């Protein structure tokens with residue numbers, strides 16, 4: 344079937360010129376709304392959630408892991424390092440790296456998370472351990488954002504990512520302490536106000552992680568507490584046909600608005 348909401352999302356997609364993927368889980372009733380829910384999209388920096396969560400999982404059996412220092416060398420800096428560049432020739436802890444990756448979208452910090460997990464495949468292994476058979480991380484930053492149409496590397500589907508984000512933030516994929524830390528980090532994101540959150544009523548609250556890459560790829564994944572309602576999990580992924588296309592955070596906002604209006 345095609346619902347009213349799916350029809351509205353299709354119309355948004357058509358006027359955007361790109362390809363839109365949406366997955367909602369409403370934890371009021373566990374129902375789902377999907378649009379291209381089983382198509383693959385480049386994750387870009389939304390993959391930082393999986394990496395940080397995998398390190399949180401490791402910390403369950405090492406109480407001091409998040410206080411562990413990681414050397415930041417001049418050679419480690421990549422293309423977007425607003426936090427790590429302050430610490431070059433010094434150290435950051437794994438908590439600091441997780442917070443920088445999630446809240447500032449620092450790519451050097453993400454690379455240290457990936458290295459802590461033994462490379463991109465360590466992030467995929469954690470996804471499999473928590474029931475996500477779809478997610479794959481194949482490369483480090485910055486090349487994981489190439490976002491080439493048809494390229495399976497560094498992709499997932501909206502359905503899989505929504506289910507994962509639910510399990511991480513609201514369910515029991517992590518220990519209680521760790522889940523609370525992940526939620527705190529997401530709620531403190533600095534980069535999200537133009538994306539999903541711009542489409543929601545202002546009384547609501549949320550935590551999110553954005554991403555962007557080539558092909559005008561513009562992504563956001565969020566856990567949302569609507570006023571007076573059980574929480575939602577929402578993924579909005581968007582990618583465009585030309586390598587040099589401009590980001591379109593407004594499309595994510597519009598998708599979120601359609602979703603919110605359909606509750």
Ligand SMILES: O=C(Nc1cccc(-c2nnn[nH]2)c1)c1cccc2nc[nH]c12
Pocket residue numbers: 388422423448449450484485486488489534553554555556557
């Ligand atoms: O690392 C990249 N982008 C990047 C770096 C750091 C953070 C983000 C980001 N976070 N939230 N939304 N975008 C995006 C990047 C790499 C290669 C080609 C790209 N074209 C656009 N961005 C690209």
